[PDB]
Amino acid sequence: SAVMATYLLHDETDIRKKAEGIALGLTIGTWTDLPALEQEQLRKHKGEVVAIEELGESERVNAYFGKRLKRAIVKIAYPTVNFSADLPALLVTTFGKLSLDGEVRLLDLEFPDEWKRQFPGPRFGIDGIRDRVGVHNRPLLMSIFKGMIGRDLAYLTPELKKQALGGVDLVKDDEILFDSELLPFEKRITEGKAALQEVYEQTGKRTLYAVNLTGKTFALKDKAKRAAELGADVLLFNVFAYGLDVLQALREDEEIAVPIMAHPVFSGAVTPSEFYGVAPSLWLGKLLRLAGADFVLFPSPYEREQALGIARALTDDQEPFARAFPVPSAGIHPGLVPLIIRDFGLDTIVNAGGGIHGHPHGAIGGGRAFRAAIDAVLAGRPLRAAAAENEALQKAIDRWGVVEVEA
Amino acid sequence: SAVMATYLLHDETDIRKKAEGIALGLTIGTWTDLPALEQEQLRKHKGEVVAIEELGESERVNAYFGKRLKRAIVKIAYPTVNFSADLPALLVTTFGKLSLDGEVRLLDLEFPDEWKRQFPGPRFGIDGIRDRVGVHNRPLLMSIFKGMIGRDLAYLTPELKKQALGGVDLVKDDEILFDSELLPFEKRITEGKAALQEVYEQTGKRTLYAVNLTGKTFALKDKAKRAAELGADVLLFNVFAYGLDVLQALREDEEIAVPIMAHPVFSGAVTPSEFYGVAPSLWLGKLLRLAGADFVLFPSPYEREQALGIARALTDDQEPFARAFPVPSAGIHPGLVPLIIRDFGLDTIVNAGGGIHGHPHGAIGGGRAFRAAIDAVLAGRPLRAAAAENEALQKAIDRWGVVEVEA
Numbered sequence: 001s002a003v004m005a006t007y008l009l010h011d012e013t014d015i016r017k018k019a020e021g022i023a024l025g026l027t028i029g030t031w032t033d034l035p036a037l038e039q040e041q042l043r044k045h046k047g048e049v050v051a052i053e054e055l056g057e058s059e060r061v062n063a064y065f066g067k068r069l070k071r072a073i074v075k076i077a078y079p080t081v082n083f084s085a086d087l088p089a090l091l092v093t094t095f096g097k098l099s100l101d102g103e104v105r106l107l108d109l110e111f112p113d114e115w116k117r118q119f120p121g122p123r124f125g126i127d128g129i130r131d132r133v134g135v136h137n138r139p140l141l142m143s144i145f146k147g148m149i150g151r152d153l154a155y156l157t158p159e160l161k162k163q164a165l166g167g168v169d170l171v172k173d174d175e176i177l178f179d180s181e182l183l184p185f186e187k188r189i190t191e192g193k194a195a196l197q198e199v200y201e202q203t204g205k206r207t208l209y210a211v212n213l214t215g216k217t218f219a220l221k222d223k224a225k226r227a228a229e230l231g232a233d234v235l236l237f238n239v240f241a242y243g244l245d246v247l248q249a250l251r252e253d254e255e256i257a258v259p260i261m262a263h264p265v266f267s268g269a270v271t272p273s274e275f276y277g278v279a280p281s282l283w284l285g286k287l288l289r290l291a292g293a294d295f296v297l298f299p300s301p302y303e304r305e306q307a308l309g310i311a312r313a314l315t316d317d318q319e320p321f322a323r324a325f326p327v328p329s330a331g332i333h334p335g336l337v338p339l340i341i342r343d344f345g346l347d348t349i350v351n352a353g354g355g356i357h358g359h360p361h362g363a364i365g366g367g368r369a370f371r372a373a374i375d376a377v378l379a380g381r382p383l384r385a386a387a388a389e390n391e392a393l394q395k396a397i398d399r400w401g402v403v404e405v406e407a
Numbered sequence: 408s409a410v411m412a413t414y415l416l417h418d419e420t421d422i423r424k425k426a427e428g429i430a431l432g433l434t435i436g437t438w439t440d441l442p443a444l445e446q447e448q449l450r451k452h453k454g455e456v457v458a459i460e461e462l463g464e465s466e467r468v469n470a471y472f473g474k475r476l477k478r479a480i481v482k483i484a485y486p487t488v489n490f491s492a493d494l495p496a497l498l499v500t501t502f503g504k505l506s507l508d509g510e511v512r513l514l515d516l517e518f519p520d521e522w523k524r525q526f527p528g529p530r531f532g533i534d535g536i537r538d539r540v541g542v543h544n545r546p547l548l549m550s551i552f553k554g555m556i557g558r559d560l561a562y563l564t565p566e567l568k569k570q571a572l573g574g575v576d577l578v579k580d581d582e583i584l585f586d587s588e589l590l591p592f593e594k595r596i597t598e599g600k601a602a603l604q605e606v607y608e609q610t611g612k613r614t615l616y617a618v619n620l621t622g623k624t625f626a627l628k629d630k631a632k633r634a635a636e637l638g639a640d641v642l643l644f645n646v647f648a649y650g651l652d653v654l655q656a657l658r659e660d661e662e663i664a665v666p667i668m669a670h671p672v673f674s675g676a677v678t679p680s681e682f683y684g685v686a687p688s689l690w691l692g693k694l695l696r697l698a699g700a701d702f703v704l705f706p707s708p709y710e711r712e713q714a715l716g717i718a719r720a721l722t723d724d725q726e727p728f729a730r731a732f733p734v735p736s737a738g739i740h741p742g743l744v745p746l747i748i749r750d751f752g753l754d755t756i757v758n759a760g761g762g763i764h765g766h767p768h769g770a771i772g773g774g775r776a777f778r779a780a781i782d783a784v785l786a787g788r789p790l791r792a793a794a795a796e797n798e799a800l801q802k803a804i805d806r807w808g809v810v811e812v813e814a
Contacts, residue, residue, distance in 0.1 A: 026583070027556060028554070028556055028557060029553060029554045029556070030554065041557070042557045044557070045556055045557040060470075060471065063467075063470055063471070064467065064470070064471045082556060082557075082583070082585075083583070083585045084585040084586055084587075084621060084622060086621075086622060086623050087648075088621065088622075088623070088624075088645060088648040088649055089585050089621060089622075089648075091648045091673055092582065092583060092645050092648050092672050092673060093583055095673060095676065096582060096583060096645070096648075096672035096673050097582065097583075097672060098675075099672075099673050099674070099675030099676045100671065100672075100674070100675040100706050100737075101675070106676075146436060147435070147436045147437065149434060149435055149436070149452050149489055150435060150448070150449045150451070150452040150489075175499065175503060175504065176433070176489070176490070176499060176500055176503060176504075178489075178490045178491040178496050179491055180491075214491060214493075214495065214496060215491060215493060215495075215496075216493050216495070216652055216655075216656065217495075217624065217650065217652045217653055217656055218625075218628070218656050221625070238495060238499050238503070241494075241495035241496075241498045241499050241503070241650065241652075242495055242650045242652060243624065243648065243649045243650035243653065245623055245624045245648075245649060246624055246650065248623075249623065249624055249625050264507065265499050265503035265504060265506075265507075266498055266499055266502060266503050266506050267506065267507070268505075268506030268507035268508070268683065269502065269506045269513075269676075269677045269683070269684050269685055270676045270677055270684075272506075272509075272680070272682075272683040273679070273680040273682075273683055273684070275679075275680075276675065276676070276679040276680055277676050277677075277680070277684075278676055299507050330507075
């Protein structure tokens with residue numbers, strides 16, 4: 001029937017008026033002066049203002065724009081008969097011209113179920129990922145392969161093993177690691193798999209490798225299919241540099257079918273502003289899940305309510321899709337595990353680059369500390385307590401501190 | 408050698424410090440404590456701060472953020488050896504993590520020639536388009552097919568002919584016109600072509616039809632190839648909802664090879680902010696031309712210097728690519744032709760929807776007024792002068808007014 005879009009509007013003129021204009025202008029154009037007979041025939045395509053909520057003016061905003069700006073949250077319904085069932089049409093219909101209209105920020109989108117049922121959602125999602133790694137009662141632990149730019153395969157392997165030996169469940173490439181002569185995509189996958197197979201054989205633990213899927217759009221699917229045939233575990237994808245629709249295409253391709261980890265890189269071109277853009281809960285949360293991302297990384301709150309909103313959209317039980325793994329990233333260290341579990345729960349992933357490699361004992365000590373921190377929180381005991389009987393965790397807390405959260 | 412990126416930074420802490428951190432952090436990561444021998448080997452991948460320009464604090468900004476923010480324009484060089492030669496890599500490398508870093512806005516990008524020579528640029532560009540329409544000494548005139556949502560083929564044809572008969576050089580679909588049962592893509596192309604062939608046979612002038620290319624990314628090329636085989640004139644593409652790289656893929660496909668018109672729809676999610684995002688001259692100008700757009704529509708200045716900057720990037724003679732047609736859009740009416748020619752020159756396109764259909768005499772009178780306005784400016788005479796001897800132009804000025812510009 002209709003997709004309901006929610007916006008934040010900052011404007012001098014009458015709000016209800018602009019809202020009405022939007023609902024009409026972005027759909028059938030004119031209405032008042034059309035013959036009754038013709039209105040009956042176009043009724044089905046007519047947009048309608050669903051609701052308005054004045055929020056009152058803000059002295060801070062007013063002072064900034066040098067004028068008085070009324071603020072409001074306007075919800076508008078756009079009949080689905082007006083556009084095709086794909087993300088590009090959705091974005092253009094709900095925020096195409098509107099994004100050029102001044103101070104209008106897209107806050108959220110609501111889809112009728114039959115429409116929504118036309119999108120894939122995650123392929124594996126949280127449960128699917130937990131089954132493949134065989135870890136069901138604790139958040140997962142992931143490290144970022146730091147300092148690989150300019151390095152070659154021979155450097156990759158020992159570095160990859162070192163992180164696995166620290167007890168991490170996953171190791172992901174750096175977001176800015178692109179295909180090169182030094183380290184080709186297929187060889188990174190193949191040798192990475194062999195290196196982790198060795199660590200598996202040595203300790204009995206299997207660590208998954210999330211490899212960066214880059215290059216030109218129309219080369220992606222063949223590259224992914226190939227990765228799948230070579231045994232890749234997870235495909236890291238910089239979705240925001242290619243368009244949401246590409247993520248959904250990779251998702252729906254039965255010849256790939258490997259978990260997809262979505263990186264937030266470049267999403268900041270769209271979300272930070274207070275008056276423009278699209279809210280992160282929608283841009284990184286709702287849409288990425290709907291498109292097919294199994295894991296979604298986003299900036300850690302260590303804005304807080306913002307990060308919770310994204311996780312909320314990623315894991316909301318109400319959606320007809322599997323849940324996606326929320327992964328707060330940036331600055332994560334063992335001392336934050338208590339807050340991470342408090343804020344995001346068990347179905348989250350502890351992701352760290354500097355927190356692993358930057359540990360005084362190296363990557364292995366880095367992983368040890370994280371694993372110790374996670375067990376402590378789960379055991380309900382203070383990290384400083386467990387730290388006394390665990391060297392690695394102790395060094396972590398001395399280096400980065402800790403924020404305890406009572407069991 | 409290296410792509411030079413220019414940013415606008417708003418920050419409390421020392422500017423030169425953050426800049427240095429960026430140049431280093433976004434490339435090799437660490438440097439100071441690496442063995443000399445290892446530095447020699449990684450030198451080639453090391454980013455460098457190329458220049459800084461303090462701009463002094465702004466009381467308005469400070470008052471808004473509630474703190475003192477130093478402002479500066481920082482230029483940074485990222486060795487091309489660090490990434491692959493494609494737009495996604497470029498965006499992620501130069502504004503991937505940085506877009507999440509707070510108040511950092513991407514202003515411009517400069518590419519070494521050998522690197523730049525790896526991108527297509529427009530296929531036809533201004534000269535190519537002017538030869539296909541056979542009009543070399545006046546700006547072109549284009550109308551937008553308004554009110555087609557909910558309408559069918561039988562309504563399309565007479566409506567299309569009416570605009571052509573007004574003397575316009577091109578008619579483009581509405582940006583939010585998607586494929587449907589009422590009017591399929593291939594039939595819109597086929598019947599549109601037959602309608603304009605009829606007008607050609609009656610007037611001796613062939614008007615071009617710019618049809619909206621929509622749908623899912625991996626269905627685009629087949630759809631475009633097909634349009635080309637059916638005789639489509641121009642393909643309208645909402646590039647910003649699919650990723651720059653998709654535009655370049657359509658561009659480089661020898662089985663399509665028809666002119667591509669880029670719409671600015673949704674680009675506003677990225678450009679309006681003063682502290683974040685990407686500057687329009689780069690987002691709609693430099694990159695769209697480099698990617699392959701023959702025409703680029705952007706919001707008309709009727710911000711001014713901003714619009715000039717985009718046109719400037721689109722037509723800059725220094726680039727190794729053909730020039731792209733700058734097309735200021737929104738609110739255009741005959742009374743603005745004098746300013747449009749003054750600001751953008753002859754190699755521009757007068758684009759109007761409401762200025763055509765909203766004319767008291769209808770679409771034909773709408774096209775007539777525009778054609779009269781354009782000739783007047785070229786004859787060096789005041790529109791009010793010509794209006795006296797031209798009914799349609801007279802009605803235009805009475806309805807929307809005019810801003811004269813002395814010859």
